[PDB]
Symmetry: C2
Subunit: 293 residues, 2 copies
């Protein structure tokens, strides 16, 4: 049984990494690129970009531990702990060469530590629509004069006594449509059919809980990154952000400049958080062009 349709020419498979069975979808030939999804979604957010990349790269899209069809982590949900699983997974398929990395939303949180600790393994890096966890997140406002705070879900999801799982259980499809559309500019791409697929996956009880454990570990991840960030990233990096409702605008690039020596950034107008779906054509073009250099 597959939660999402595999593109033609790709395989759905599993690999045990440090005692955790990870699900992934893989296709193509050539140097490896790993695509890492974020909250509310799975490998499937990449399914339009994957066939295009697979024309010249080997492409792997895993499900984050506990999400999609991947088992929960055995160590923990902090960025440094999860990053181990993803780094070892990639190195099973690229043991002798650097690989490229694309990450969205908490995919950034779950990859930054292995990038900074294994810089020679990362050829090129693309990050979109999430802050790297650091002290900047403690200044984001809870409440805005216009639109909506992009950030109040940090506290909701991190609240103790399983607040979020307890309130959302039984209402998963409702909640997912609300939080996806509230963070989108081009809401019309989120058909009821597509929302059904995403909701069915994260409504699995262990996946609902896993989703929020990433936020419960966020303060730990901030403390981890305070040490890791004493070394800047050296490899070519590109940031993408939406310029519309739900987009991070100029923050994505401006923060990355503190972390990276070689970075270019783009803000996609009329696009919110969910760039692969809201703005597939320009986003795919930017990623393919950047990795094809």
């Amino acid at each position: 049984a597959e939660e999402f349709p595999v593109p033609n020419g790709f395989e759905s498979a599993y690999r045990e990494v440090d005692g955790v069975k990870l699900h992934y979808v893989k296709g193509g030939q050539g140097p490896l690129v790993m695509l890492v999804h974020g909250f509310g979604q799975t490998w499937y957010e990449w399914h339009q970009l994957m066939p295009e990349l697979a024309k010249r790269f080997t492409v792997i899209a895993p499900d984050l531990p506990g999400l999609g069809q991947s088992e929960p982590p055995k160590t923990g949900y902090s960025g440094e702990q999860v990053a181990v699983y993803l780094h070892k997974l990639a190195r099973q398929f690229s043991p002798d060469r650097p690989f490229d990395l694309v990450a969205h939303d908490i995919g950034i949180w779950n990859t930054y530590p292995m990038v900074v600790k294994n810089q020679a393994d990362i050829a090129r890096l693309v990050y979109m629509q999430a802050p790297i966890p650091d002290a900047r997140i403690y200044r984001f406002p809870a409440f805005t004069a216009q639109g909506e705070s992009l950030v109040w879900h940090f506290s909701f999801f991190a609240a103790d006594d399983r607040l979020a799982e307890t309130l959302i259980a039984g209402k998963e499809r409702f909640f997912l449509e609300h939080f996806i559309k509230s963070h989108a500019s081009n809401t019309e791409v989120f058909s009821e059919r597509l929302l059904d697929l995403y909701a069915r996956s994260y409504a699995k009880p262990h996946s609902l809980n896993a989703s929020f454990e990433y936020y419960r570990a966020l303060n730990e991840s901030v403390r981890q990154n305070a040490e890791l960030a004493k070394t800047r990233l050296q490899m070519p990096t590109m940031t993408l952000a939406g310029g519309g409702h739900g987009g991070m605008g100029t923050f994505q690039l401006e923060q990355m400049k503190a972390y990276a020596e070689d970075v270019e950034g783009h803000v996609l107008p009329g696009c919110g958080h969910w760039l692969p779906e809201e703005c597939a054509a320009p986003m795919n073009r930017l990623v393919i062009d950047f990795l094809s250099r």
Copy 2:
């Protein structure tokens, strides 16, 4: 039936104000003091203060429109609209002399406009544990280095799609215990029975919705207060705030200094947000002494 026990010597009653049937509890003799409750609670949060105050004053504690046993407003939930109902209710009982006002949490939001517009009607003012809605609220951080913030509920409650009602329905007692304890220093003062009573009141579907409509109107109240605040408050004012977890500390007095010419403030160590319950004895003493001068 009554949702909460009425103290001896007090009456539970109703008055029509602008076509809206308001519930209140009233007792005592002498000049009028109106006590206005906040979110999650009803008139009952004042039940320990009321018998003491009624030795020197006529005391009235209404349920906010839509909450407790009061009918929802027929105009709207912004501060200026709700303050009309509370001002006219007070004037029914004190038509010939100014009255005192004590307000907690969103009771502040729902009274500040009628105080500033009807200053000759207000003898003395006591405000505790909430910002006056203004641009200062756009600074409060969404997330803290210790976990969930005190203010992310602004955005949870203001969200559309009836987000809060939909997620909290069926879990009203669970959610109320969470937000009471997350804003408390002294959780021991909240019996399981007291939490049961508050939860059963705000779980009423029109009351659960009314609770969050105050927040859906918050930005409108900010915009209203931007104009109203061009007129400073001239009556004697006291602020109170908790010094412990859940307390606003020095913010309460420091903001009030920008609104009021004649203000004194106290911060109560060992107390959080729920001052009438967490710190009943010192809070009652400070209020009684301030109003008795």
